[PDB]
Paper text:
To prevent cell lysis, bacteria have mechanosensitive channels that are gated in response to the elevated membrane tension and release solutes, restoring the turgor within the cells. One of the medium-sized paralogues is called YnaI, with 5 TM helices. Structural studies have shown that the main difference between YnaI and MscS are extended sensor paddles, which create a periplasmic indentation in YnaI, and much smaller portals in the vestibule that provide the cytoplasmic access to the pore. The TM paddles are in contact with the surrounding membrane and are therefore responsible for sensing the membrane tension, while the vestibule with the pore formed by the TM3 helices conveys conductivity and selectivity.
Author numbering:
A (entry chain G): 114 to 334
B (entry chain A): 280 to 334
C (entry chain A): 114 to 224
């Protein structure tokens, strides 16, 4: 394949040399190349593709939406993964399956790029579904959960922190939980989330309420 | 409107404040008051119902 | 990378200087650059992109759909978050996950 490609390259070089030469050296053959714009189209499409990719790479370098080793994604098209290398033509992304993903540079031209690798906090969200018969303790449970969250060493007190009775559900009364953690590490965030969930379970059990299963009323006949 | 297993009543209003926490607190208070009213008037909230013909 | 980019920039500068110069200074080489419109396309696409983004930013400044620190969204495409900065080319939006979101200015043109 390499030798065939070299042969074709030198054939193209000979063709271009013949085209450059005028009547003094053989015949220019300009009309043949411009017989129907074949040479024009051949040059134009290749140049357009190469220049588009090259300029997209240059703009990527100048704007700096992401760097090597950054976790990125896009709501427009999926490119999720960790950046491995930014070439002049193709950007290599390592997916979370440990598989290469080759993205042409021009695909970044007009899309919104998210950079989770540059996040400042990790969010924790969950819903507590209590039974409809536990409506008398909703306020106390919410207050207890908020107090527990406000005293947790792993929670960031400068970020949003909401715990309120949110909405009626089909078979439960839902309570929203919304907070952030100081750390941005995967394992530490997961451990903090697990600890918070266990504490929430303990609080709910201690206050006399319980979690609601999908309920249903049956009329027998 | 009539539902599959309940009679639905719509609630539609606005709050003076535009703050997230204050709006959520007002919503929770309104929901608790609605629950109290419904319980006091003798009605109750409907679970997904179903009629079963045994054989 | 910075030094390589500088080298390529000065190479392009030398190329443009050679193109500007006529027969008095070497050869203009205009035909080579216009052999198949390579230079024309290279200038046109870059200029179109840069000008589109710049003019979108200018229109954003003049119309004032939003300001710094404003929660925004769009039913057409998702950009939800709080505006962090409005640059000449890219607008930075902080999502509710506390992650940066870089939106080219031209994406606000028709939505
Ligand atoms: C082994 C034969 C190789 C022949 C390659 C021909 C290449 C033609 C290029 C035409 C470009 C317009
Ligand atoms: C110097 C600025 C370069 C801008 C490059 C834009 C490339 C757009 C390609 C779009 C292909 C669909
Ligand atoms: C070839 C075009 C070069 C454009 C360079 C733009 C540099 C932007 C720097 C922004 C720093 C905040
Ligand atoms: C037709 C224009 C081709 C331009 C190719 C430029 C390649 C630059 C590579 C820089 C080394 C990574
Ligand atoms: C038609 C022009 C082709 C230019 C090829 C550039 C190759 C650059 C390789 C950079 C490796 C780091
Ligand atoms: C280290 C080698 C760098 C070579 C850079 C070549 C840049 C070519 C620009 C062509 C623009 C049409
Ligand atoms: C002074 C008015 C500037 C208007 C800029 C419009 C840019 C449109 C870009 C569309 C790209 C798809
Ligand atoms: C370059 C074009 C400038 C257009 C300026 C429009 C100003 C609109 C002001 C509207 C105020 C209500
Ligand atoms: C080819 C036209 C380029 C125009 C670039 C204008 C850049 C203005 C920046 C203003 C400072 C924030
Ligand atoms: C090709 C023209 C490039 C113009 C680059 C403008 C850079 C403006 C930076 C403004 C920072 C506040």
């Amino acid at each position: 394949s390499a030798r065939i490609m070299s042969r074709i390259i030198k054939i193209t070089i000979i063709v271009v040399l013949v085209l450059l030469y005028g009547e003094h050296f053989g015949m220019s053959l300009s009309g043949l190349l411009t017989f129907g714009g074949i040479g024009g189209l051949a040059v134009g499409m290749a140049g357009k593709d190469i220049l588009s990719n090259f300029f997209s790479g240059i703009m990527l370098y100048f704007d700096r939406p992401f760097s090597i080793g950054d976790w990125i994604r896009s709501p427009d098209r999926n490119i999720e993964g960790t950046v491995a290398e930014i070439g002049w033509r193709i950007t290599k992304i390592t997916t979370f399956d440990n598989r290469p993903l080759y993205v042409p540079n021009s695909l970044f031209s007009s899309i919104s790029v998210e950079n989770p690798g540059r996040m400042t906090n990790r969010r924790i969200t969950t819903t507590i579904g209590l039974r409809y018969e536990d409506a008398a303790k909703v306020g106390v449970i919410v207050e207890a959960v908020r107090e527990m969250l406000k005293n947790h060493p792993a929670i960031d007190q400068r970020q949003t922190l909401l715990v309120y009775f949110n909405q009626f559900a089909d078979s439960s009364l839902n309570i929203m939980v919304y907070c952030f953690t100081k750390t941005t590490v995967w394992a530490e965030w997961l451990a903090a989330q697990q600890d918070v969930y266990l504490k929430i379970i303990d609080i709910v059990q201690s206050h006399g309420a319980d979690f609601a299963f999908p309920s249903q009323t049956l009329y027998m006949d």
